[PDB]
Design a protein around this nucleic acid. Structure first.
Ligand SMILES: [Zn+2]
Lengths: 694, 282, 349, 48
RNA sequence: CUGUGCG
């Protein structure tokens, strides 16, 4: 608007009205007049009659390349015997020669084709799902080590809550020494607890929350007590006042709401710490980085262990999604091939039984895929369960769905209750298939199940395309898709191996197979890698046009085309409409024949189709385009940094605290990409203030 | 036709009580649809026994169970065992008059009035009065405390014909020595102060009043043969039908309105086959 | 699963919460209000005070449809709160002081009492009753679920509830006293008694008031047959067959546009002026009596106003979207039968 | 009885335009008649 | 900005 703060907001419109009246009263070009009179109105569709519609000596070449074969006045009986001749020719030149596009099913050969394409016979993998996939191996080990086998802990958890809440205030403006202070409090309360009640470190702690010389700290970080005393040794002698400076700071300019009456100011007696350290021997983890099957024969397993397997899977999934939620702005005390020793890693806990508890150790934090190690603790003894590598984001479904999937299992199996004996060999197979699908989320699995749905649609019916089998095969990697594909094809065969024509209880079989194919929806649809996803999106975007040969290089972006650009423009237009009605070579290339368009238009115009052109109710009644999907755009970052720098310059009428970053948080509203962008813009504004300082 | 709706409400209340005992408070009266008593703007005619209590429901009392026995007139024929007490200066005259009013029916009540006069001390002759106020308290129902507030102003106490027996008596009680129209309540409320309450709930089981488990009285109602059968239908459940038909004939023993003629109407009654119930009472 | 999912966040399970457990085939002819009422009824084992409140609501509906002359004063009485409005409904229906201090004993903790749970989630960068928002939405014209729940848990452990003042949740749930006086024990962590919340009483509202409100809502929604008491009845896993809804509506079922707007203008002009219709040029059609004073919309509009967990008016002006339901005879066999005798009790005429 | 502040609420509800202009500029106790001073009388709504 | 729980 033309409004401002210098006028009484009632004269500018009058000025505009008088100015337009003067300009329309007399003048002195053509477009300039209309633009100027159009730029002084307030509010103003089709019917763009005021446009000029001028030519530039190129419209014609478009016209005789598009509007020479178009007549739209062909009568009807000529179309009739032209189509008669076309059909008579088509019958005995391409159909009798075996160049068709559709064929009968011939179910049996379709079954051998399916078995050949799906069931891998040249692969070296074993027919044992648990030991082909790492995660299922780990969950099997956990579930078969679990099935066959007091105010101290709550006080400990409460003080953990206290410290974990107070750490978030970042009132020390520093991180490393802050964690040092927290772990000093931690060891002080250790030695305060262990002074008396000797049946607490061995009984209520080994069976509670501790493993070999590895004690959990704030921020879900587990730290080695040895290195704890080693780091407490420093800051003594160099600056013995340090702890004292940490003591008076919690009283003044502090919330002053704490229960650290004595567990804070006490000096840590290292003799107790080293005694505790020597009490427990070293069982330090290995986290195996980077052949005989005795796997209980799941097909001969009782009807109890499978639900507990699902329950353990759900527990591991919840542990993974908890590891998702760890803090991002966290840096380890000391930084770190084939075997890396763990001393300051991150840990999460998950619960199995009254005495044994599972631990998930991981080294990096963040948003994306990582590598994890699963361990157990029965009665203070720490055992090896395994390690794996995956993306936790793809495990949100099984977080608590340990009962609905089971119910799906028995209801789908009971769908086939017509024959006693068909459930027995299909139930466990279906459950194992579901387990493999949940534990191996990937695009390939759901694409393969879609191919199965299409295969079922073709088989159950009578006539199918000749290029069906070529669209069902997907290449396999990581040897994890081979087992799920084998299970799927085995279920399909077992349900359809024998006489399975449409003359029996076939509708329910079709329903069961259709649901098996639709099980593909279990995998979450959120692009495991995004960069490769734009790579492929652009790849399939540009492949057809490059194949056709009409993708020109960057135009003028204003409405001017060079001689080569317009030449290839017309070449592509001509190639589009250069198809005949007799040659069979051009059956897969883009394009169309103008003749058949004339036929169809002429036939439709003279009310010959089921509909005509007798319409009613006449129809004539700031993101950047170069980056889509990014959370923030360069224009937006520049605008925000300019606004912040202008505000900070205005307030300087020097000194500036960290509250400037608060302004960043005020105009922004965080994921890892969000916090990286926030760090980048904080950097930018900080050195901006720096350059204005000089 | 007000009489027909009246007897219809009567039968509804009788048969609703036929399944389980209940109290006659607003919870169990105003929760019934029929309720045309607040209708009939010309409300000259009513049912019978309850004609008393609903006469107060047209002003919506918050009561549980008053002992309504105005048939034995409680407003009149009242004992006048009244007296008075001394005063306490704050001229300020403070009095507390307590009475033991009874009623024509079997009832009792104690009513005490606290009264304060702000007056002007006289020189020699009598007195000089300025303002007077009173407050009622003590037991008494909607008719008993109205009786009390009526008789407190109809007494030979200070108000009336002198009757101020001074005789240097009340002064001797006050000063230690041995030498010589407030009728705005009209309700059940005890006038903003009184003794303990909320006891003796009456329950109604078989058309007879039960104050604590004792039978008081039972009234009359007809059943025609069409209203009873059409009211026999569903309710919600069957043992309700069992109880109601088991208890109907005992109530019929106190009534002589045998107008259920014997025809196919008996069969439409019989649709709910309960033979040994209807033959048990005999 | 969803109840465990919401409980894991630290919110705490509530009488409404998520969808009720132990449901029946009666998803047909039943909206959110009916299933919520069913959950509340199933909370109490022996239904006596719920039955009494249902009789109260039956009387209110009897006298609000055609009976006596009423309505538009409930608009006055409901706006105050939960306790006084419910009490007043009681002596308009018939009660005692015993009812007043008996029915109001059942209380539940509402964290969103002084407003809404303040929170910031993993939303896209750079950015009052819900009924007004629904009207505004109706008039006008990449994130991962795992990270969404992660942000939910993140925001759910901070100072979210409001008072006066911002504070956490755990002190609210630890300020309750475990009196255990045989009335707050039949449904732990759901319903409490009056003296059990003396330490914290701002977040304490009666549940019978909510049940009454939902009963009246169902009366406006799908008939008066929801007033009766549920009775229980006395197949080869392959018998599928189709069901049509059997709802009867007494609210002029068509329910065209520009009817709620006139009602909200008439009753609450202040709410009509601000936060409502700045962006409108056809006010006149709804202004000069576009069928004002509907059959029941006048009374069933304030209940969506006061209680922020009904979602009824925004539900009202939509199609059933199903019009048919596939079920098995196996589930039809044990479906509960809830059909009501007439509210006249059908002796009237 | 027909107390005061009953016609004003009816004329506000039915004819807001007539209520705004030519009516109540000189009033400070609008609130008593504003928050349901016995709206929707027995017959005043139709006989106005 | 600012997470501590599935027994
Ligand atoms: Zn194996």
């Amino acid at each position: 608007n033309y409004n401002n703060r210098f006028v009484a907001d009632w004269v500018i419109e009058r000025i505009r009205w008088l100015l337009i009246e003067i300009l329309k009263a007399s003048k002195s070009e053509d477009q300039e007049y209309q633009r100027l009179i159009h730029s002084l109105s307030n509010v103003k569709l089709e019917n763009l009659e005021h446009l000029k519609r001028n030519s530039l000596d190129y419209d014609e070449r478009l016209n005789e390349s598009l509007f020479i074969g178009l007549k739209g006045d062909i009568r009807e009986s000529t179309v009739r015997e032209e189509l008669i001749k076309l059909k008579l020719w088509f019958k005995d030149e391409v159909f009798s020669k075996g160049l068709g596009k559709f064929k009968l099913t011939d179910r049996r050969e379709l079954l051998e084709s399916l078995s050949s394409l799906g069931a891998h016979l040249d692969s070296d993998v074993s027919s044992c799902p648990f030991c082909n996939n790492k995660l299922m191996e780990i969950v099997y080990n956990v579930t078969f080590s679990c099935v066959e086998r007091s105010n101290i802990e709550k006080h400990y958890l409460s003080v953990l809550s206290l410290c974990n809440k107070i750490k978030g205030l970042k009132v020390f403006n520093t991180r490393r020494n802050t964690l040092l202070f927290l772990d000093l409090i931690m060891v002080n309360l250790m030695v305060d607890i262990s002074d008396s009640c000797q049946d607490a470190i061995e009984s209520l702690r080994k069976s509670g929350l501790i493993v070999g010389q590895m004690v959990m700290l704030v921020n879900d970080r587990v730290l080695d007590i040895l290195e704890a005393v080693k780091l407490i040794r420093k800051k003594i002698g160099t600056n013995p006042n340090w702890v004292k400076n940490c003591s008076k700071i919690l009283e003044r300019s502090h919330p002053e709401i704490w229960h650290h009456l004595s567990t804070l100011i006490k000096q840590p007696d290292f003799n107790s710490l080293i005694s505790i350290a020597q009490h427990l021997v070293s069982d330090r983890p290995i986290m195996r980085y980077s052949k005989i099957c005795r796997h209980k024969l799941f097909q001969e397993m009782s009807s109890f262990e499978q639900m507990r397997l699902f329950k353990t899977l759900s527990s591991i999934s919840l542990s993974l999604i908890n590891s998702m939620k760890t803090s991002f702005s966290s840096r380890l005390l000391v930084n770190e091939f084939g075997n890396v020793r763990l001393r300051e890693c991150y840990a999460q806990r998950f619960y199995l039984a009254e005495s044994l508890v599972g631990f998930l150790f991981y080294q990096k934090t963040g948003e994306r895929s990582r590598c994890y190690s699963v361990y157990l603790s029965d009665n203070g003894v720490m055992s090896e369960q395994g390690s794996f590598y995956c993306d936790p984001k793809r495990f949100f479904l099984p977080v608590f769905s340990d009962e609905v999937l089971a119910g799906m299992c028995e209801e789908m199996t009971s769908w086939l209750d017509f024959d006693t004996g068909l459930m027995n060999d299909t139930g466990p197979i279906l459950r194992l298939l579901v387990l493999a699908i949940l534990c191996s989320p990937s695009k390939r699995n759901q694409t393969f199940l879609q191919g199965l749905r299409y295969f079922l649609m073709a088989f159950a019916n009578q006539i199918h395309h000749i290029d069906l089998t070529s669209k069902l095969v997907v290449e396999c990697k990581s040897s994890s898709e081979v087992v799920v594909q084998r299970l799927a094809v085995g279920l399909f065969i077992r349900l359809l191996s024998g006489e399975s024509d449409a003359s029996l209880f076939f509708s329910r079989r079709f329903k069961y197979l259709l649901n098996v194919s639709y099980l593909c929806h279990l995998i979450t649809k959120e692009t495991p890698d995004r960069l490769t996803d734009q790579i492929k999106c652009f790849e399939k975007f540009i492949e057809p046009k490059v194949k056709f040969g009409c993708a020109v290089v960057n135009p003028s972006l204003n409405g001017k085309l060079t001689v080569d650009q317009e030449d290839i423009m017309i070449n592509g237009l001509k190639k589009f409409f250069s198809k005949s009605l007799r040659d069979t070579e051009d059956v897969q290339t883009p394009g169309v024949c103008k003749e058949l368009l004339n036929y169809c238009v002429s036939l439709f115009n003279r009310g010959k189709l089921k509909v005509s052109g007798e319409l009613k109710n006449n129809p004539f009644r700031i993101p950047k385009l170069d980056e889509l999907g990014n959370i923030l755009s360069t224009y937006d970052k520049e605008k925000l940094v300019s606004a912040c720098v202008s505000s900070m310059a205005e307030r300087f009428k020097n000194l500036d605290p960290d509250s400037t970053d608060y302004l960043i948080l005020k105009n922004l509203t965080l994921t890892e990409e969000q916090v990286e962008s926030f760090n980048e813009i904080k950097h930018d504004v900080q050195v901006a203030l720096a350059k204005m300082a000089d | 036709s007000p009489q027909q709706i009246c007897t219809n409400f009567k039968t509804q209340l009788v048969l609703s009580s036929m399944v389980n005992p209940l109290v006659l408070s607003t919870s169990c009266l105003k929760s019934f649809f029929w309720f045309n008593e607040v209708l009939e703007l010309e409300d000259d005619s009513q049912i019978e026994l309850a004609e008393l209590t609903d006469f107060a429901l047209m002003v919506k009392n918050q009561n549980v169970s008053r002992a309504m026995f105005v048939e034995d007139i409680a407003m009149g024929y009242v004992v006048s065992n009244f007296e008075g007490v001394r005063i306490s200066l704050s001229d300020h005259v403070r009095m507390s008059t307590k009475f033991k009013l009874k009623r024509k029916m079997v009832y009792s009540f104690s009513l005490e009035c606290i009264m304060d006069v702000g007056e002007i001390q006289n020189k020699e002759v009598i007195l000089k009065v300025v303002a007077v106020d009173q407050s009622v308290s003590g037991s008494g129902g909607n008719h008993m405390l109205l009786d009390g507030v009526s008789v407190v102003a109809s007494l030979p106490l200070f108000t009336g014909q002198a009757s101020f027996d001074l005789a240097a008596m009340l002064i001797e009680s006050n000063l230690a020595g041995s030498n010589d129209s407030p009728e705005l309540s009209d309700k059940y409320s005890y006038r903003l102060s009184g003794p303990e309450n909320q006891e003796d709930p009456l329950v109604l089981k078989d058309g007879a009043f039960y104050v604590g488990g004792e039978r008081l009285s039972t009234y009359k109602v007809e059943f025609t043969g069409d209203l009873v059968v059409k009211a026999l239908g569903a309710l919600e459940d069957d043992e309700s039908v069992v109880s109601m038909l088991h208890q109907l004939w005992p109530y019929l023993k106190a009534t002589s309105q045998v107008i259920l003629f014997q025809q196919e109407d008996f069969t439409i009654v019989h649709d709910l086959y309960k033979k040994q119930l209807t033959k048990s009472i005999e | 699963r969803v109840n465990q999912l919401i409980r894991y966040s630290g919110y705490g399970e509530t009488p409404f919460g998520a969808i009720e457990d132990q449901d029946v085939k009666d998803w047909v002819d039943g909206s959110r209000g009916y299933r919520l009422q069913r959950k509340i009824e199933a909370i109490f084992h022996d239904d006596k005070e719920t039955s009494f409140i249902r009789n109260c609501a039956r009387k209110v509906f009897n006298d609000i449809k055609r009976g006596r002359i009423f309505e538009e004063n409930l608009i006055n009485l409901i706006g105050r709160g939960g306790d006084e409005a419910l009490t007043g409904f009681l002596q308009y229906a018939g009660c005692s002081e015993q009812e007043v201090n008996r029915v109001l004993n059942y209380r539940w903790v509402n964290l969103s009492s002084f407003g809404d749970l303040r929170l910031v989630l993993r939303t896209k960068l750079m950015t009052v009753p819900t009924l007004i928002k629904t009207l505004q939405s109706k008039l006008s014209r990449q994130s991962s679920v795992a990270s969404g729940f992660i942000g939910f848990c993140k925001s759910m452990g901070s100072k979210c509830v409001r008072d006066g003042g911002f504070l956490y949740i755990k002190e609210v749930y630890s300020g309750v006293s475990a009196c255990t006086c045989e009335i707050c024990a039949l449904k732990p962590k759901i319903i409490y008694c009056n003296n059990s919340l003396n330490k914290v009483s701002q977040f304490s509202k009666p549940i019978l008031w909510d049940y009454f409100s939902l009963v009246l809502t169902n009366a406006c929604e799908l008939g008066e047959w929801v007033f009766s008491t549920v009775k229980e009845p006395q197949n080869n896993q392959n018998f599928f067959w189709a069901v049509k809804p059997k709802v009867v509506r007494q609210i002029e079922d068509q329910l065209g546009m520009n009817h709620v707007l006139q009602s909200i203008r008439r009753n609450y002009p202040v709410l009509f002026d601000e936060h409502l219709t700045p962006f409108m040029n056809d006010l006149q059609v709804s202004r000069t009596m576009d069928s004002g004073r509907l059959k029941f919309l006048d009374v069933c509009i304030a209940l969506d106003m006061m209680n922020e967990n009904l979602g009824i008016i925004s539900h009202l002006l939509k199609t059933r979207d199903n019009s048919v339901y596939i079920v098995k005879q196996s589930d039809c066999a044990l479906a509960h039968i809830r059909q009501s005798s007439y509210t006249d009790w059908e002796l009237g005429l």
